[PDB]
Every structure is written in C-alpha cells, then in structure tokens.
C-alpha cells in the first residue's frame, strides 16, 4: 500500500482519488492520502472550491516512483512532483502517518470498481497520449483537446488519443465503399487493432482511459474517443466473440459508476441507441443493455 | 451548406456545379405472383446529373441487370448512383470538374461523401428545394432511350435544348424547373399543352419543342395554370 502525501492544503478543493473525493478546507491540516493499492492506475484529481472551473489532475502509478503534491501559489494549482530522495520520502510519510494527517484510500474489500475501470489502462500507454517525458504521471484537465479536435491549438498540452474517422481514406478501401461503411470490420480488425493498437487489450485500454477523462475532467474530447472506440466495435459485423464479451463488462462498469445526474451531457444518445438497438453487435451487450434500461431508460 | 430559395442565384454563377437526382435509378412494378403473393419487377433506370448553368444532362442509364442477385436494393441504389457520379467525375479533365455537388435527396450525403473522398475539396451539398427532377422520365426523349437500353449507358443531353442562345441561365432553368413540376403534378395535362399544336415541332437534336420567345411565354402561363388547378382539384379550392 503506498502514499501520496501533500506539502499541505493552502486553499480549498475538493480532492478526487480514483472514484472517491472529500472536502478540505482552506489551510485544514491535510497531508494526504495512504493505503492506495498496488497494482492499478490511479488518478488524483482537483476542482478548487472558488472556480469550479477546470477539474484537473495526474495519472499516476505507485510501482514507477515516490509522489506528492505541492500547492504552487504562482500557477494556482496542486502539482504533482517525485521525490527521488528515497530515505526522505520515506521519513517525510512515516511522520505524516504517525501524526494521522492522512485520508486513508477507503477500498471495501468486495470492491472490484476500480479494477474493473482500469483493467486494461497502463501507465506506458497513458504517457504516448499526454506527452511529457520528464515526467512519470500525466496531467490532464477539462480543457485540453485531442489531436483530432485541432484537426478541425497548442500541441504540446494535446490529447494524442488515436484519430478515429469513419469518412476517411484509412476507414474506406478504394473499392470497398459502401461494404466498409456499413460493416467497418476492415477498419476494426486490420487497421486499428492489427495495425495501430496490435491487440485488443490496448484499444481497450485507451477506451477506458478516454472515458475516465471524459467522467473524472468532463473533458469533451475524450467523450468524443469513447464514443467513437464504442462505435467502432458496434458497427462491425466480424468481432472476435472474446472483445464482445469484455466490451460488455468493460461499459457495464462504465454506465455503472457514472453520475447519475451527468449522464444527459457525457452519454451520446445516436451512439448508444444504435450499439444496443441497430448495430450488427445489438445482441451481444447483454449487461449494458440491462443497465442502461434500468437506470437511463430516457436516453432510449 | 444546404442550398435553398435564399441562395438561389449561386446555381448561375462561374463555379462548376452539378445536381445529382437518384429517385430514378432504382423503378419497379409491383404485382402478384401465382401463389398470391407480391413481388417487384425492376425496369431500367437513370441517373440525373445535371450543371444548371449550362444544361449539360449526364444521364446514365441504370440497367437492370445490375441489380441481379443483390439485396436491399433500395439501399445499394444510393451506393450505386455514388459510385456513378464519383467515376463521372473522375472522366472529365480536372478543369471539368465540379466545386460542388448538389443531392437532391439527404440519403445521398454519405454515399457520395465517402466515394468522393479522393477530391475533399468538392463540396457535397444538400438542398431544402423541392425539385421536379423525378419527372424527368415524362420527357418521351429520356424515357425512351432509358427503357431502350440493353446494357449500362451514359447518354449526354443538353436539357436546355438551344434556349441558352436567346435567355439565361436562370431563366433556362426556371423554365425546366416549371415544365417539370407540370409534368410531375398532372402529366397528361402537361404533354397535352406542349403538343396541342401540330404545327410546332421537335427538333431531332433537341427535347422540347420550338416555341418562339412569345410562345413560351403562353406555354409558361398554361403551366402555372395546371400547377394551381391541379393545388385546387387536390385541396379543394
Ligand atoms: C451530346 C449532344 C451535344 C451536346 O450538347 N454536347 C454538350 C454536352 C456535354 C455533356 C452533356 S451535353
């Protein structure tokens, strides 16, 4: 189990780590956050509690370094920064612990949530989709634009999530036209998952961080990905019967833990009502569907 | 974006335009069969391809065979009529080519969208105008050549016949768009008016008889009058 401490809590925020948060206070004595399990991807995210605007916060994993956060009173933001200081880390968080100034990581043990969210997310890959080498955790806010959408401006502070285009030369073989557009199997199986993400596991894997971004930052871009990954698989006719079967766990969760009272601006209703309804993969969702009736039956 | 009554004028400026109409590519009759069942017939059918500034009609003829052994036809028809405009572009020499491409029905948006990918700087456009060309198989000239057919076949027309010599664009195509909906909206009436005179005739070369300036004038009226009879024989008023 490993810690997150914090330098201290100089202005008031509400404080994200994976699927829980809580309220500190303006200068209340906090230093952080203990007994984050191992193993997984996690993220600690931020809305400050005088400008909701921008949600912000770092992807990061235990295993890859010793991490904390520092109010920057410049910027105006907590940042995350490693300590390579090993034996000062250590003694810097046996003191925090010792003095109980820690939120501890509170996981029910039955719990697999957070699991079943990140399953297939690695930190590697996150690093290729926000690029800051310098760095081993990811900054990421509500603001900043994919690739795609800059298609359509600072490419530094980009989301470099894979384009998906279904009118496009790499979507459409010449010849192919209408076969390709109505059954993308093509574009599934040879191009994306051969060619560019080489097994299902990393599409899958960038689908469901795309989604944490769009719940965690309500980052619009990242919806659009998730959509467009979902979308992809619903419209092929020729999907390995393995992929259908996670996808259905994988959104289960997703629609799952989404806020109930966002799910109007975050869920696309052409999207969701052609994947359950029309696609060629409209029976093969059998838990989505069943939760997605049962706890948004006004989308459909 | 969509072309409609406020942008109007742009269909006769100096940038390359084409309407393509595909409600007559894929024709049927439906009847019965010997078990008391229904079933549809195909008849050859044509893509409308039209530039309304210069009357150049490139009418390709969509013969039945082409449907053999497929299925929801209605659907592929749509793919077909694309895959038709996008090789017709690609024959002409690139100083041919149009801007845009104008789509009478919104079904044809993607269709010709994806087989035009090749040329994104040709805009694919639709329209909110209620266009008479589906009446274009009331011309005897077009139907003709299209039941005629025994193979696939683009046959060139200029729908304009010569009147470009005497009026312009806009006028020409005001013109057809009248005939057309006259055709569209009682046929007979409407071939009655242009052949009640024996005595004006069609030329070989051309689609529509040889009125005089003053006779297309009493023409066009005769045609506003059965579009507004035929409103009231139908509403009642
Ligand atoms: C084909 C009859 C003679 C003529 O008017 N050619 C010009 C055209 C080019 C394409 C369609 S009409």
């Not at chain 1, 230093?31 to 770092?58: C, L, W």
């Not at chain 1, 052609?274 to 009736?293: A, D, G, P, R, V």
């Not at chain 2, 013969?63 to 002409?92: C, D, I, M, P, Y």
Request: proline share 4%; net charge negative; aromatic share 12%.
């Amino acid at each position: 189990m490993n810690t997150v401490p914090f330098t201290s809590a100089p202005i008031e925020v509400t404080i994200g780590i994976d699927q829980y948060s809580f309220n500190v206070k303006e200068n209340q004595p906090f230093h952080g956050i203990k007994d984050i399990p191992i193993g997984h991807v996690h993220v600690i995210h931020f809305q400050h509690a005088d400008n909701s605007s921008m949600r912000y916060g770092y992807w990061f994993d235990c295993r890859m370094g010793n991490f904390y956060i520092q109010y920057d009173p410049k910027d105006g933001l907590y940042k995350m920064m490693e300590e390579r200081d090993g034996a000062k880390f250590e003694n810097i968080v046996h003191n925090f612990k010792e003095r109980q100034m820690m939120v501890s990581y509170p996981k029910i043990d039955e719990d697999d949530t957070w699991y079943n969210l990140t399953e297939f997310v690695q930190m590697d890959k996150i690093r290729k989709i926000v690029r800051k080498d310098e760095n081993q955790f990811s900054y990421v806010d509500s603001s900043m634009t994919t690739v795609q959408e800059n298609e359509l401006s600072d490419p530094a502070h980009s989301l470099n999530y894979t384009v998906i285009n279904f009118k496009s030369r790499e979507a459409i073989r010449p010849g192919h036209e209408m076969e390709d557009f109505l059954d993308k199997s093509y574009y599934l199986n040879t191009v994306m998952l051969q060619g560019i993400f080489k097994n299902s596991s990393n599409y899958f894997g960038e689908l469901q961080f795309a989604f944490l971004n769009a719940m965690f930052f309500g980052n619009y871009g990242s919806s659009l990905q998730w959509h467009a990954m979902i979308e992809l698989i619903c419209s092929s006719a020729t999907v390995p019967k393995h992929m259908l079967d996670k996808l259905d766990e994988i959104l289960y969760y997703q629609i799952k833990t989404l806020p109930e009272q966002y799910s109007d601006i975050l869920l696309n209703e052409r999207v969701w009502n052609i994947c359950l309804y029309s696609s060629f993969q409209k029976n093969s969702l059998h838990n989505t569907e069943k939760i997605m009736e049962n706890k948004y039956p006004e989308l459909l | 974006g969509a072309m409609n009554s406020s942008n109007y004028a742009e269909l006769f400026n100096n940038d390359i335009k084409l309407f393509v109409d595909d409600t007559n590519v894929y024709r049927v009759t439906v009847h019965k069969t010997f078990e008391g069942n229904v079933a549809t017939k195909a008849i050859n059918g044509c893509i409308f391809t039209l530039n309304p500034k210069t009357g150049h009609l490139f009418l390709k003829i969509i013969h039945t065979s082409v449907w053999a052994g497929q299925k929801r036809l209605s659907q592929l028809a749509k793919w077909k009529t694309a895959e038709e405009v996008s090789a017709l572009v690609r024959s002409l020499p690139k100083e041919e080519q149009p801007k845009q491409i104008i789509v009478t029905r919104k079904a044809m948006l993607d269709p010709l969208e994806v087989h035009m990918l090749d040329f994104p700087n040709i805009a694919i456009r639709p329209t909110e105008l209620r266009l008479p060309f589906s009446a274009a198989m009331s011309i005897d000239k077009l139907s003709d050549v299209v039941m005629k057919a025994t193979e696939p076949q683009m046959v060139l027309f200029n729908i304009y016949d010569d009147w470009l010599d005497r009026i312009s664009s806009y006028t020409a195509f005001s013109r057809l768009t009248l005939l057309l909906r006259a055709l569209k909206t009682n046929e007979e009436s409407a071939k009655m008016i242009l052949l009640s005179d024996p005595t004006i005739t069609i030329k070989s070369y051309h689609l529509w008889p040889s009125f005089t300036d003053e006779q297309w004038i009493t023409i066009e009226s005769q045609m506003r009058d059965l579009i507004l009879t035929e409103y009231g024989r139908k509403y009642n008023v």
